[PDB]
RNA sequence: GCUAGUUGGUGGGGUAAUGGCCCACCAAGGCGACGACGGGUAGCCGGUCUGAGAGGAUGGCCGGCCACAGGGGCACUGAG
RNA sequence: GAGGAAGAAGCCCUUCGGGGUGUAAACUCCUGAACCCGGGACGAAACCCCCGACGAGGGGACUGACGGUACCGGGGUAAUAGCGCCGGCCAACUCCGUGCCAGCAGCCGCGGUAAUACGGAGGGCGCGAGCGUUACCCGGAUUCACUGGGCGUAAAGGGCGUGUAGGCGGCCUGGGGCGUCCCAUGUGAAAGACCACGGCUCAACCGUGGGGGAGCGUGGGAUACGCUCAGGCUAGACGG
RNA sequence: CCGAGGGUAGGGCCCGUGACUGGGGCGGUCGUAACAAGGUAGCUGUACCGGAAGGUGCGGCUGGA
């Protein structure tokens, strides 16, 4: 395009659609669990990955991912979620930050207790 | 200093009053290239002594009324009704332009 | 005498009724860090094979890189189709900013203080051969001043 | 939001 | 802060005899003269050719680790030589040589610059008289790095003095021995020492 | 025609990638005032102010260097790259503090001002600034 | 009216004033007319005080009015010794 | 595509003062693809963060100006 | 903190000889954060009284929340370590368990009994009073391209004309000096940024000094190019 | 006289939601339209038709013979 183009027509800035709108702003948000199941994921994975409906603060209702090994949500638990999607599992789009609410912790875990929510063992 | 600017006359439609029509050169802050933009500025003619196509000089002045704030200061040259078709084009072309 | 830098190596693949048949390429930059550097794309049915071959066409091969107190005369910039490389000068307290193609030529040539860039198609084989050529156009006051 | 019996309401 | 714990490994890991320790180090009781190989279960495993990131890596590593400094103040010091006035790569050098735990070394009042620290810190040294406890100062030629004079009565300062008679210190450096005093006349020149550090590359490092 | 100078410049780019000995461009006094610098810069031997149907041109006379051995003999370019800075479109226009030094130093960028159309280097040293015509080397 | 005052600047446990001139109703730190000196007051070196007394001398003038203790340090440098 | 105090005029009221700011009358204007009108969104700047630069992003704290004092309207007193 | 074994135990690996944690530790001396005693601030010289004259100048007195805090002096105990990561990008490799399960996940992707990718262990790498994660900004992104991209076939030439506004526009000479260039001058507050010097033991922080730009106002100058006005031409264009 | 606002009546834009309905994206049943002259060269604008791909007419393209 010619200069006379560009003053004309100028160049068009490009935005960024967030991928996770139901955030609203915020870094993490309080939810409760609307449904709590197991879901098979897509190719070329299998598995039941358990995952979480969550009806946010916002009003908004998302289903989260629960990372770990064993949990102890269900119906009615008061959650947490940051943001981050999974990669198989289309649609969940958000992750149940363990160690909060009534989200447990890992028991056994040693390694990475940062990121499962585990204190330190003695 | 109080400001001077040149422009021609595109209405003596008005009483004691004429409107003028003032372009102005610049370069475009990123594209370099040398632009021209333009403002109608209402003038006091307090002896309706401007004709149209008129061009002439206008200093800036205390209010005389809503968006009148500029007299014509002096003839500068007479007669340029060219400078005129191509206002009154422009503005009539708009017609094209609805829907 | 010639310090060798073993560049890039890769695996290609031919289809032929029975499967695929594979061969290697080895592209290596040869220099001594006081002006001389040659560059060589060697392929054999065989990696260390192949890069041996390589390193004899780098020798076999070489460029003048006027130097300046291990930077060089002049900006320059070259494109090899495709990818284009940007070659600056630098005082002495910078270093061979460059990625890894475009450093690993410039080590040997004992270049030491250059700003560079990669734009374009950063495919290595084609920057490679752009930085070479892009050191090959170099010239100094000198010659520049016995051409006028 | 709401729902079956919890005082909790979202 | 300063990192304590095992310290043979870290030159064995470097691949390269750092005088970390202090007596011991010239000693062939020296883990390095004896296992000059990476610690841990695959020391003695015939080693994967170096990436140019590994390269830069372990060569900024060795040049910290030298003189036992935080990650945070070394790259402190290496972006304000990088801001001030010509070559980056000495500059750097010199400013992290001009810190008042490494004088004190040099000066040999101490073995290890690890116990150097501890002399600067608890008090045990000053520097133009006034004493100063922070092993950071800026050491600003024209100073006087002497003992603090009310803690020369003591058993290990004498004794690193006992065994400084002669040695010729840094051509920047003027050890008035038995005074217990040095100076520091002018910042290190480049060339001035040869630790095993490619200070070009430390360089190339931060610039990623 | 919309640019004489782009054109001018051209014909000379045009004409040394094939060797013309000499190349034609038609006249102005603006174009023998780049061209003076050009030869005097020893980026041609020079011109003449010549004639072809009665019509004002300038022969202009193409400098390039040695043959060279190898496989391709084509000596290298006196002017190895020639292009327009100021233009119709867009008009550059520096002054003196932003002249802009070329090549780290081996070319150099004619321009033109209130006190005559100088290069580069020239115009530093006389203290001016105008329009960057083009850039050469 | 207009005065001659001590705008504060410095850290906390670092007095570090600046006598100044300004209208009497800006905030102590706030935009000011002219400065006309410093004062380190807890003299932590050499020239702790510094007023231009050719200015200090317009200023009073004028009209400025001076703080009480601004005088302390106006007088102390001497600007009315005849 | 927008505009009836709309745009100009003469007179007067108002103010510390200019002005369709306000009122009476008269004239038919005024603005608009160089984006009027309308819808979204935001207090602006010194600066700040990023970046080789150009550029992008941003306005917390400190300084500067505006604006608001539950939502609104009003005027009194007064240098304000 | 200096020293301390061809090198304990426990744990890990192993070809069953060993290899590793590892100078690391236990022990040897040396210093001496915390605490313990003592002293202990600048921050405050003015308003006020006196002589002079209620002025200049001279003289004297009261006033400290922080705070018995900083700091100084003596005495003085070996005195918290944690988090991320170790398929590739990317620095860090082994066993066991598990068996498309359970799980990991930023993208490529890993797991279907021999997993450097899942869980634990050992070891390693990396940071250290912090280390990771989420959210958002600029970066890499020359992927909105002024610097600094493109459209035959990758995304991209309007189906084709005519022409309005707009953009752009040959050769020569004069006038103007609008753009453009130069000098002077005002403005470009303070804080910040920058460079030097200093202040608190260093630094963060903080003071003094320096250097200014862009951009706008005013005045002077230049006239190549762009503009504008006047005169001329014939190479574009139109016409006979 | 004006005037917060209240009331009445009629319009404009936005948001949310609605029996039911239309396709759209992600993870067995019917044929086999395309990819090789793909077994009627392929695509195409349009038109009519047909469970479905698709077929046929008219004209066009070659990215076909
Ligand atoms: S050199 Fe000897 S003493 Fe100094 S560190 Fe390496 S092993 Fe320990
Ligand atoms: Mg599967
Ligand atoms: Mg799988
Ligand atoms: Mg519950
Ligand atoms: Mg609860
Ligand atoms: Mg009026
Ligand atoms: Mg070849
Ligand atoms: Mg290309
Ligand atoms: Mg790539
Ligand atoms: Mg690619
Ligand atoms: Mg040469
Ligand atoms: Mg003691
Ligand atoms: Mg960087
Ligand atoms: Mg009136
Ligand atoms: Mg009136
Ligand atoms: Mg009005
Ligand atoms: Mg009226
Ligand atoms: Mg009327
Ligand atoms: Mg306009
Ligand atoms: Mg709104
Ligand atoms: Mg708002
Ligand atoms: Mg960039
Ligand atoms: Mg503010
Ligand atoms: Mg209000
Ligand atoms: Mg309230
Ligand atoms: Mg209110
Ligand atoms: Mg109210
Ligand atoms: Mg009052
Ligand atoms: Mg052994
Ligand atoms: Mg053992
Ligand atoms: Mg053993
Ligand atoms: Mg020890
Ligand atoms: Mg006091
Ligand atoms: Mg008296
Ligand atoms: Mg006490
Ligand atoms: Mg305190
Ligand atoms: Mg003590
Ligand atoms: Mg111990
Ligand atoms: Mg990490
Ligand atoms: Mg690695
Ligand atoms: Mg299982
Ligand atoms: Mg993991
Ligand atoms: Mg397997
Ligand atoms: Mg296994
Ligand atoms: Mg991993
Ligand atoms: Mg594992
Ligand atoms: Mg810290
Ligand atoms: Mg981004
Ligand atoms: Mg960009
Ligand atoms: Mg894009
Ligand atoms: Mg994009
Ligand atoms: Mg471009
Ligand atoms: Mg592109
Ligand atoms: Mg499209
Ligand atoms: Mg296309
Ligand atoms: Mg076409
Ligand atoms: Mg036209
Ligand atoms: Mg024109
Ligand atoms: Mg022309
Ligand atoms: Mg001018
Ligand atoms: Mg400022
Ligand atoms: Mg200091
Ligand atoms: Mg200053
Ligand atoms: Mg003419
Ligand atoms: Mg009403
Ligand atoms: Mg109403
Ligand atoms: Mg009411
Ligand atoms: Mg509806
Ligand atoms: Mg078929
Ligand atoms: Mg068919
Ligand atoms: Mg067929
Ligand atoms: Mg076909
Ligand atoms: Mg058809
Ligand atoms: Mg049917
Ligand atoms: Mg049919
Ligand atoms: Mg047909
Ligand atoms: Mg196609």
């Given at each position: 395009?010619?200069?006379?183009?560009?003053?004309?027509?100028?160049?068009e800035?490009?935005?960024?659609?967030?991928?996770?709108?139901?955030?609203?702003?915020?870094?993490?948000?309080?939810?409760?669990?609307?449904?709590?199941?197991?879901?098979?994921?897509?190719?070329?994975?299998?598995?039941?990955?358990?995952?979480?409906?969550?009806?946010?603060?916002?009003?908004?209702?998302?289903?989260?991912?629960?990372?770990?090994?064993?949990?102890?949500?269900?119906?009615?638990?008061?959650?947490?979620?940051?943001?981050?999607?999974?990669?198989?599992?289309?649609?969940?789009?958000?992750?149940?930050?363990?160690?909060?609410?009534?989200?447990?912790?890992?028991?056994?875990?040693?390694?990475?207790?940062?990121?499962?929510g585990?204190?330190?063992?003695? | 200093?109080?400001?001077?600017?040149?422009?021609?006359?595109?209405?003596?439609?008005?009483?004691?009053?004429?409107?003028?029509?003032?372009?102005?050169?610049?370069?475009?802050?990123?594209?370099?290239?040398?632009?021209?933009?333009?403002?109608?500025?209402?003038?006091?003619?307090?002896?309706?002594?401007?004709?149209?196509?008129?061009?002439?000089?206008?200093?800036?002045?205390?209010?005389?009324?809503?968006?009148?704030?500029?007299?014509?200061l002096?003839?500068?040259?007479?007669?340029?009704?060219?400078?005129?078709?191509?206002?009154?084009?422009?503005?009539?072309?708009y017609?094209?332009?609805?829907? | 005498?010639?310090?060798?830098?073993?560049?890039?190596?890769?695996?290609?693949?031919?289809?032929?009724?029975?499967?695929?048949?594979?061969?290697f390429?080895?592209?290596?930059?040869?220099?001594?860090?006081?002006?001389?550097?040659?560059?060589?794309?060697?392929?054999?049915?065989?990696?260390?094979?192949?890069?041996?071959?390589?390193?004899?066409?780098?020798?076999?091969?070489?460029?003048?890189?006027?130097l300046?107190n291990?930077?060089?005369?002049?900006?320059?910039?070259?494109?090899?189709?495709?990818?284009?490389?940007?070659?600056?000068?630098?005082?002495?307290?910078?270093?061979?900013?460059?990625?890894?193609?475009?450093?690993?030529?410039?080590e040997?040539?004992?270049?030491?203080?250059?700003?560079?860039?990669?734009?374009?198609?950063?495919?290595?084989?084609?920057?490679?051969?752009?930085?070479?050529?892009?050191?090959?156009?170099?010239?100094?006051?000198?010659?520049?001043?016995?051409?006028? | 939001?709401?729902?079956?019996?919890?005082?909790?309401?979202? | 802060?300063?990192?304590?714990?095992?310290?043979?490994?870290?030159?064995?890991?470097?691949?390269?005899?750092?005088?970390?320790?202090?007596?011991?180090?010239?000693?062939?009781?020296?883990?390095?003269?004896?296992?000059?190989?990476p610690?841990?279960q695959?020391?003695?495993?015939?080693?994967?050719?170096?990436?140019?990131?590994?390269?830069?890596?372990?060569?900024?590593?060795?040049?910290?680790?030298?003189?036992?400094?935080?990650?945070?103040?070394?790259?402190?010091?290496?972006?304000?030589?990088?801001?001030?006035?010509?070559?980056?790569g000495?500059?750097?050098?010199?400013?992290?040589?001009?810190?008042?735990?490494?004088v004190?070394?040099?000066?040999?009042?101490?073995?290890?610059?690890?116990?150097?620290?501890?002399?600067?810190?608890?008090?045990?040294?000053?520097?133009?008289?006034?004493?100063?406890?922070?092993?950071?100062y800026?050491?600003?030629?024209?100073?006087?790095?002497?003992?603090?004079?009310?803690?020369?009565?003591?058993?290990?300062?004498?004794?690193?003095?006992?065994?400084?008679?002669?040695?010729?210190?840094?051509?920047?450096?003027?050890?008035?021995?038995?005074?217990?005093?040095?100076?520091?006349?002018?910042?290190?020149?480049?060339?001035?020492?040869?630790?095993?550090?490619?200070?070009?590359?430390?360089?190339?490092?931060?610039?990623? | 025609?919309?640019?004489?100078?782009?054109?001018?410049?051209?014909?000379?780019?045009?004409?040394?990638?094939?060797?013309?000995?000499?190349?034609?461009?038609?006249?102005?006094?603006?174009?023998?005032?780049?061209?003076?610098?050009?030869?005097?810069?020893?980026?041609?031997?020079?011109?003449?102010?010549?004639?072809?149907?009665?019509?004002?041109?300038?022969?202009?006379?193409?400098?390039?260097?040695?043959?060279?051995?190898?496989?391709?003999?084509?000596?290298?370019?006196?002017?190895?790259?020639?292009?327009?800075?100021?233009?119709?479109?867009?008009?550059?226009?520096?002054?003196?503090?932003?002249?802009?030094?070329?090549?780290?130093?081996?070319?150099?960028?004619?321009?033109?001002?209130?006190?005559?159309?100088?290069?580069?280097?020239?115009?530093?040293?006389?203290?001016?600034?105008?329009?960057?015509?083009?850039?050469?080397? | 009216?207009?005065?001659?005052?001590?705008?504060?600047?410095?850290s906390?446990?670092?007095?570090?004033?600046?006598?100044?001139?300004?209208?009497?109703?800006?905030?102590?730190?706030?935009?000011?007319?002219?400065?006309?000196?410093?004062?380190?007051?807890?003299?932590?070196?050499?020239?702790?005080?510094?007023?231009?007394?050719?200015?200090?001398?317009?200023?009073?003038?004028?009209?400025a009015?001076?703080?009480?203790?601004?005088?302390?340090?106006?007088?102390q440098?001497?600007?009315?010794?005849?």
């Open positions: 395009p010619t200069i006379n183009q560009l003053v004309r027509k100028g160049r800035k490009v935005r960024k659609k967030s991928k996770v709108p139901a955030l609203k702003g915020a870094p993490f948000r309080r939810g409760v669990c609307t449904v709590v199941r197991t879901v098979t994921p897509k190719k070329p994975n299998s598995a039941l990955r358990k995952v979480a409906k969550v009806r946010l603060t916002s009003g908004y209702e998302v289903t989260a991912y629960i990372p770990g090994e064993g949990h102890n949500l269900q119906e009615h638990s008061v959650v947490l979620i940051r943001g981050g999607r999974v990669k198989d599992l289309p649609g969940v789009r958000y992750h149940i930050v363990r160690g909060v609410y009534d989200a447990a912790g890992v028991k056994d875990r040693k390694k990475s207790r940062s990121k499962y585990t204190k330190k063992p003695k | 200093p109080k400001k001077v600017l040149t422009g021609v006359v595109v209405s003596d439609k008005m009483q004691k009053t004429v409107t003028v029509l003032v372009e102005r050169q610049f370069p475009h802050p990123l594209y370099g290239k040398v632009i021209k933009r333009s403002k109608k500025y209402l003038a006091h003619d307090p002896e309706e002594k401007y004709k149209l196509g008129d061009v002439v000089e206008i200093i800036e002045s205390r209010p005389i009324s809503k968006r009148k704030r500029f007299r014509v002096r003839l500068v040259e007479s007669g340029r009704m060219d400078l005129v078709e191509k206002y009154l084009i422009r503005r009539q072309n017609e094209s332009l609805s829907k | 005498d010639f310090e060798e830098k073993m560049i890039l190596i890769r695996r290609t693949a031919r289809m032929q009724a029975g499967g695929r048949r594979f061969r390429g080895a592209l290596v930059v040869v220099g001594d860090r006081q002006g001389r550097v040659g560059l060589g794309f060697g392929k054999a049915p065989e990696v260390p094979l192949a890069v041996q071959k390589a390193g004899y066409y780098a020798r076999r091969n070489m460029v003048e890189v006027p300046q291990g930077t060089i005369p002049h900006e320059i910039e070259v494109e090899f189709g495709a990818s284009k490389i940007v070659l600056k000068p630098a005082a002495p307290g910078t270093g061979v900013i460059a990625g890894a193609v475009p450093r690993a030529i410039l040997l040539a004992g270049v030491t203080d250059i700003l560079t860039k990669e734009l374009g198609s950063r495919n290595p084989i084609n920057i490679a051969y752009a930085t070479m050529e892009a050191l090959r156009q170099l010239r100094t006051k000198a010659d520049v001043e016995r051409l006028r | 939001t709401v729902x079956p019996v919890x005082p909790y309401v979202x | 802060g300063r990192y304590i714990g095992p310290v043979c490994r870290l030159c064995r890991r470097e691949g390269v005899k750092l005088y970390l320790k202090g007596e011991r180090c010239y000693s062939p009781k020296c883990a390095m003269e004896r296992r000059p190989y610690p841990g695959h020391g003695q495993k015939r080693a994967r050719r170096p990436s140019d990131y590994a390269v830069r890596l372990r060569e900024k590593q060795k040049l910290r680790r030298i003189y036992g400094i935080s990650e945070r103040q070394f790259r402190n010091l290496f972006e304000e030589a990088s801001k001030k006035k010509g070559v980056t000495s500059v750097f050098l010199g400013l992290l040589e001009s810190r008042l735990d490494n004190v070394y040099r000066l040999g009042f101490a073995v290890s610059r690890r116990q150097a620290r501890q002399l600067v810190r608890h008090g045990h040294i000053t520097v133009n008289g006034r004493r100063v406890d922070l092993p950071s800026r050491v600003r030629p024209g100073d006087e790095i002497a003992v603090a004079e009310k803690s020369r009565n003591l058993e290990l300062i004498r004794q690193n003095l006992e065994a400084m008679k002669g040695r010729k210190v840094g051509p920047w450096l003027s050890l008035d021995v038995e005074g217990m005093k040095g100076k520091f006349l002018r910042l290190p020149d480049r060339e001035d020492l040869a630790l095993p550090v490619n200070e070009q590359l430390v360089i190339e490092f931060y610039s990623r | 025609l919309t640019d004489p100078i782009a054109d001018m410049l051209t014909r000379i780019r045009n004409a040394t990638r094939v060797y013309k000995e000499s190349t034609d461009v038609p006249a102005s006094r603006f174009k023998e005032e780049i061209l003076r610098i050009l030869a005097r810069e020893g980026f041609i031997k020079g011109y003449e102010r010549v004639d072809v149907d009665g019509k004002p041109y300038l022969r202009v006379y193409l400098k390039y260097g040695p043959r060279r051995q190898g496989p391709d003999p084509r000596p290298e370019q006196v002017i190895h790259h020639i292009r327009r800075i100021s233009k119709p479109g867009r008009r550059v226009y520096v002054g003196v503090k932003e002249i802009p030094r070329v090549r780290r130093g081996l070319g150099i960028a004619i321009l033109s001002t209130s006190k005559g159309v100088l290069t580069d280097r020239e115009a530093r040293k006389l203290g001016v600034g105008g329009e960057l015509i083009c850039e050469v080397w | 009216m207009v005065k001659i005052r001590l705008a504060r600047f410095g906390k446990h670092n007095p570090h004033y600046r006598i100044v001139v300004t209208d009497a109703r800006r905030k102590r730190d706030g935009k000011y007319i002219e400065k006309i000196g410093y004062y380190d007051p807890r003299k932590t070196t050499p020239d702790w005080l510094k007023v231009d007394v050719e200015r200090a001398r317009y200023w009073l003038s004028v009209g009015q001076p703080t009480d203790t601004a005088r302390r340090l106006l007088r440098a001497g600007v009315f010794r005849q």
